[PDB]
Amino acid sequence: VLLLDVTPLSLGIETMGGVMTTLIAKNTTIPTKHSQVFSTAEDNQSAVTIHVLQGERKRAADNKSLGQFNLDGINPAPRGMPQIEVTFDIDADGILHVSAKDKNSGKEQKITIKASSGLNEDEIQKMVRDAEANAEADRKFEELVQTRNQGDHLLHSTRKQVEEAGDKLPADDKTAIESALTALETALKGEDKAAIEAKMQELAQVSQKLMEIAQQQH
Amino acid sequence: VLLLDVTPLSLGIETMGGVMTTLIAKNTTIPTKHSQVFSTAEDNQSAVTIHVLQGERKRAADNKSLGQFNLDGINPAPRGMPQIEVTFDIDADGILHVSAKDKNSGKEQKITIKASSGLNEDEIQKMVRDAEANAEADRKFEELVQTRNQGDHLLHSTRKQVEEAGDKLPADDKTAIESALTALETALKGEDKAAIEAKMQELAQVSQKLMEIAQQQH
């Protein structure tokens, strides 16, 4: 072959924290079909938004929006339990089909995105240069979003563990932990990675009795 | 400058499932220092092994081993709660210092790796060609390790939720769930991504009452 139809830019979705998560890497030959399974960020979340992105930046807001759609009818569950399969399918014609399926309900929604959508040539080239100009800023954002999500995990898992602990947790421990949880909830609102790590650390330092209780319960 | 000291290959650690997780990307100018926070895979895990890797492959076994060391004295806790900070620090001399610190205990261990360690020039070039020859095989492995870890999450979270559910969970539901959990535990032993997804799906399909109970408890 003298030509190869390839994707000029990565294609993916926005995940928690406003980061692009790639489903089809830049320079993939089409036709192609990839899937990954995602979950909910909150207890009892009833719907997710699938926001389809084109580009090479880590920040979702810095990539091109191809469209978005909602999947609802997610059944009441703890965060992280539902399995929402997202598939990106680019056919022989260069049409992208994105679907999200809830593996519990079997409910599914799709967006179809015409071959002509997204960034034109000049934007594509600016994009490839921008990811490269900003590799460091993007790395730092990726590490911040990671820390923030780990903090959110710790926040929510700890609160759950205090509730299952009940009386097993001493008064002093529970005061220390809940002060720390408030401070971490606040730091999760900022963009200061060290501050989040500082509150996580404080929570790790005050929660040792709680962790023992939680481990012993199961 | 007419020269720039840069890393010829990525440096990282082996994480759960035998995948390399990069701490310092290929082509990073030194001196440099990056950190990320990791956790434990098991309830009550008392130690982790930090296995330092050089190379561009997704499979840890396909990269060059720079050394390994253990961090223990991790206090009894549920999987995913401990915060083990791993830092890669390459100084002006090209020496890599790797340390792991438990943020709860403050316990820390390090390995120091001389500038001369790891792959020589010819292996470096073979490595860069191999990651490229095997981009697809590596992608598939990465997606398998991801699915496997999500399945492991589901397995362990579900078992915890059955225990906290107790009598709240109907007899029929609990039979269906525990059959599914056994089947998923078995599939997690294989390398068949679809089979794991099939058992996860079955668990999602039988657990809807359990998820309602779990959400209501918190």
Partner: peptide, 8 residues
């Protein structure tokens, strides 16, 4: 719309 999905 609603929250974006989380990677597990």
């Amino acid at each position: 719309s609603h929250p974006r999905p989380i990677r597990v």
